[PDB]
Design a protein around this ligand. Structure first.
Ligand SMILES: [Mg+2]
Ligand SMILES: [Mg+2]
Lengths: 95, 325, 52, 57, 133, 107
RNA sequence: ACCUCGGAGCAGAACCCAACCUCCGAGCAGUACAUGCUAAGACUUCACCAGUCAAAGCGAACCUCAAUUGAUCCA
RNA sequence: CAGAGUGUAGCUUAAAAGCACCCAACUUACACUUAGGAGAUUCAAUUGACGCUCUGA
């Protein structure tokens, strides 16, 4: 009841090659999860070629750098633009 | 009028500044667990409970486990039923005593027999009632066995190197409650054998009245440091055998501590009648079970929107009455 | 869209019940309880009884 | 076949065992880096603040 | 001499008679609280507990690989535990249970195995009705 | 234009501490302003009723939805890792004991 | 222009509460075919009529939906 | 190489636990679930002696 000391006890609203590439993407996702970063989305973009994405948002420079290094440590990368090499992968950021 | 909460409100600490940083229970199981934990905790707002409610040994064990694993090598797992008897034995040896307490608590032996105050039955008591040749019907703590099977006194073992074995019904039959009926009383026993020890009160079978429910007999076993006197012939008089274990424990069992328990359920049977007639020498009491009558509101003069059944609810009874003609 | 129809039990004759069914589709057959027979029995559709 | 399956299970187990160690190692490495960073920031603070600020940017 | 109301005060009396009151409600909340005894299985990392509980919350009977007697000598482990419990149940005289798992839990093999073990032991997982009138 | 609907007369019909016989309706509502607790049922309207003779009591109890009911589960999942939902529950605390053993005869 | 029924505000916390006040909608669908029989005890749109809920029992298994409707006599 | 804090596997008003963690399957992937997996009181009689963290040289 409103006037009772147990007022808002129920209140809840306020609380609320290709294969290889895929594997790599998965790994990246896992890493992100581990390190506590928001993985927003992932795509399945179209000899043959195959692209995968891991959309990321919010990470400080030092931490970000570390993450990048870990990713670096095959196929390719593309996010300052930071490309590298060993089908295709493209971890687009939003820091 | 907005009153502040008496103690701390739930969900206060976890809301925080941001919601998107936290872990959230992606599962249900975690949530369930949390809920359970919360329930277990007390709170200030009434609430459910208000209204209703060695190292070496370890190392050895580890080694054994390792050995087992090696033996398996695992393949079997990739379907082994395991020996149960051995497990049971182990339990008896080690945490059986611990377990027994819980059962006792559930069954209200400590509250009724000892007036409160729990204790661990350390020494494992092993009783069994003989039924023909074999098998001996074992009195495991909690078991249902009939008074036909309990007509003659049982065989007892425990593997312990003095004792006093007792057996009492906790309900208090026939006469007023907070009373108990003893079935025998073995005393000043040396070691594992009953025949060597003395007997004051000899064995009756259980004698639960018909439709009285289920009764809970209890064997008791204590540790004797000092040998002691006790207190009445081969008697079947009921007014002698009425005795409560609490008072007895208090005014006498001072150089004594109980170490072994086993409780045993009883119902009506054809032997009960015999017991009542032959040795007790009286008419056996029959016990039904009567529920309280149906409610109904007060008799209303113009019932209004009830059916023609209104009048059948208030009537004594059924047959057609003819007033005066 | 929906028709009302009467359904006649084969066993436990005399007992008829009223049900819905779409106007476009099949004549209805249905298992259902007869309290006369005191068993489940097949009813068959017979005569529509208003349409709606 | 049975034998093959048995082999396979063992192999899988081995793989699992391997992976966890690697993961642990990675974690350790990360932790080390973090520690270094923590040290470094403190040092910067102690020494010259402008530089620290720049680093942070 | 005999009294009119002999008061048998065995806690489990009205359960075996199949007359004592089950808690009827909680039809929104899970699990349903209408049972004399409930088989609560609690799985974790390492060890798998199994319990027998009343409405009160008093754990009457249990079996776990933590209890170290059965740690001597996983689905198999679970099965073993269940078997042990069944034996325990028999000794206690709890031959009836209610088992209200989550759907996933129900589906799971370990749970099934446990159930089977219980059945073998001689403990039904349904429990008789209250008997009114 | 529009509708003018009559008052629905819903709400609590029996308050905490009232003696409520088996069958008495306790509280009527659309949606769950109260939930069924011990010995309290739910009709098709969500209306709460006493399943036994006894006294009504109200309590704020932790709420766990049924696994099969999806929306609630989702909500639960959404909440942060130390959160518990809580909800109000209505119980009947039974008075008269179901049974009394009486002496029929001496046979 | 409206005339029956329902949901939200006015009507902020047990019900109740108007206007040719402000705003949404309904006059159906879908799944069944034990939408079988009966029955303690309640609620009720401020009357009545209409509505609602419903333990147990006997029969059987192993309802969704807010509104979704209409008396009597007559056919 | 001299001192101080101590010293249950990642982590705990745990006492060999529970949380974390790993592999496979379902998953675009994550998540959930189901099967499996692996882990510890640093060591000698509350005292001493090996390991870290930290401060000196
Ligand atoms: Mg009225
Ligand atoms: Mg019913």
């Amino acid at each position: 009841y409103k006037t009772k000391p147990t007022h808002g006890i129920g209140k809840y609203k306020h609380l609320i090659d290709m294969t290889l590439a895929e594997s790599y993407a998965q790994y990246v996702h896992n890493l992100c999860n581990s390190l506590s970063i928001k993985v927003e989305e992932s795509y399945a973009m179209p000899l043959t070629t195959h692209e995968r994405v891991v959309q990321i948002s919010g990470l400080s420079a030092t931490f970000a750098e570390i993450f990048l290094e870990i990713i670096q440590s095959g196929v390719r990368l593309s996010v300052x633009x930071x490309x590298x090499x060993x089908x295709x992968x493209x971890x687009x950021x939003x820091x | 009028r907005r009153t502040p909460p008496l103690g701390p409100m739930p969900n206060s600490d976890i809301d925080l500044s941001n919601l998107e940083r936290l872990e959230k229970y992606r599962s249900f199981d975690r949530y369930r667990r949390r809920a359970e934990q919360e329930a277990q905790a007390p709170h200030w707002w009434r609430t459910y409970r208000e209204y209703f409610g060695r190292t070496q040994q370890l190392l050895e064990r580890k080694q054994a486990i390792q050995e087992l694993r090696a033996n398996v090598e695992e393949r079997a797992a990739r379907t082994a039923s395991v020996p149960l008897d051995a497990v049971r034995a182990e339990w008896e040896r080690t945490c059986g005593p611990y377990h027994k307490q819980r059962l006792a608590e559930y069954y209200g032996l400590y509250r009724d027999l000892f007036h409160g105050a729990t204790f661990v039955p350390r020494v494992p008591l092993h009783v069994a009632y003989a039924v023909g040749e074999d098998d001996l019907m074992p009195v495991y703590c909690g078991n249902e066995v009939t008074p036909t099977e309990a007509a003659q006194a049982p065989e007892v073992t425990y593997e312990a190197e003095l004792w006093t074995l007792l057996l009492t019904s906790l309900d208090g039959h026939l006469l007023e409650p907070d009373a108990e009926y003893l079935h025998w009383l073995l005393t000043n026993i040396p070691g594992n054998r009953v025949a060597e020890g003395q007997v004051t009160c000899p064995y009756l079978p259980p004698f639960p009245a018909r439709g009285s429910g289920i009764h809970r007999l209890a064997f008791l076993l204590f540790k004797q440091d000092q040998p002691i006197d006790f207190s009445p012939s081969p008697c079947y008089q009921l007014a002698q055998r009425t005795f409560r274990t609490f008072d007895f424990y208090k005014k006498h069992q001072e150089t004594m501590t109980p170490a072994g328990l086993s409780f045993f359920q009883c119902r009506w049977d054809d032997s009960v009648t015999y017991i009542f007639h032959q040795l007790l020498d009286m008419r056996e009491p029959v016990f039904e079970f009567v529920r309280p009558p149906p409610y109904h509101p007060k008799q209303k003069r113009f019932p209004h929107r009830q059916p023609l059944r209104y009048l059948d609810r208030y009537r004594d009874s059924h047959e057609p009455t003819y007033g005066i003609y | 869209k929906n028709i009302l129809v009467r359904m006649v039990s084969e066993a436990g004759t005399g007992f008829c019940f009223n049900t819905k069914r779409n106007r476009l589709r099949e004549k209805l057959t249905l298992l259902h309880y007869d309290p006369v027979v005191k068993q489940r029995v097949l009813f068959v559709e017979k005569k529509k009884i208003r349409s709606l | 076949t049975f034998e093959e399956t048995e082999r396979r299970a063992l192999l899988l187990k081995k793989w699992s065992l391997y992976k966890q160690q690697e993961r642990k190692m990675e974690r350790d490495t990360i932790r080390a880096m973090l520690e270094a960073q923590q040290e470094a920031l403190e040092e910067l603070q102690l020494e010259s603040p402008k530089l620290h600020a720049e680093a942070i940017k | 001499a005999v009294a009119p109301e002999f008061t048998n005060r065995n806690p489990r009396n009205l359960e075996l008679l199949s007359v004592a009151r089950k808690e009827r409600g909680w039809r929104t909340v899970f699990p349903s609280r209408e049972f004399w005894h409930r088989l609560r299985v609690i799985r974790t990392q390492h060890h798998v507990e199994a319990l027998v509980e009343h409405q009160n919350g008093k754990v009457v009977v249990s079996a776990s690989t933590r209890e170290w007697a059965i740690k001597k000598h996983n689905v198999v482990a679970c099965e073993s535990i269940g078997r042990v419990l069944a034996q325990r149940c028999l000794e206690a005289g709890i031959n009836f249970m209610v088992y209200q798992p989550t759907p996933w839990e129900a589906a799971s093999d370990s749970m099934k195995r446990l159930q089977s073990a219980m059945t073998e032991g001689g403990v039904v997982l349904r429990e008789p009705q209250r008997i009114y009138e | 234009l529009g509708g003018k609907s009559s008052g629905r007369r819903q709400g609590i019909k029996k308050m905490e501490g009232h003696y409520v016989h088996a069958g008495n309706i306790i509280a009527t509502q659309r949606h769950f302003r109260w939930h069924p607790g011990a010995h309290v049922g739910v009709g098709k309207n969500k209306c709460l009723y006493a399943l036994e003779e006894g006294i009504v009591r109200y309590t704020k109890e932790v709420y766990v939805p049924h696994p099969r009911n999806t929306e609630a589960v989702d909500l639960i999942t959404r909440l942060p890792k130390g959160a518990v939902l809580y909800k109000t529950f209505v119980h009947v605390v039974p008075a008269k004991p179901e049974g009394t053993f009486k002496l029929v005869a001496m046979l």
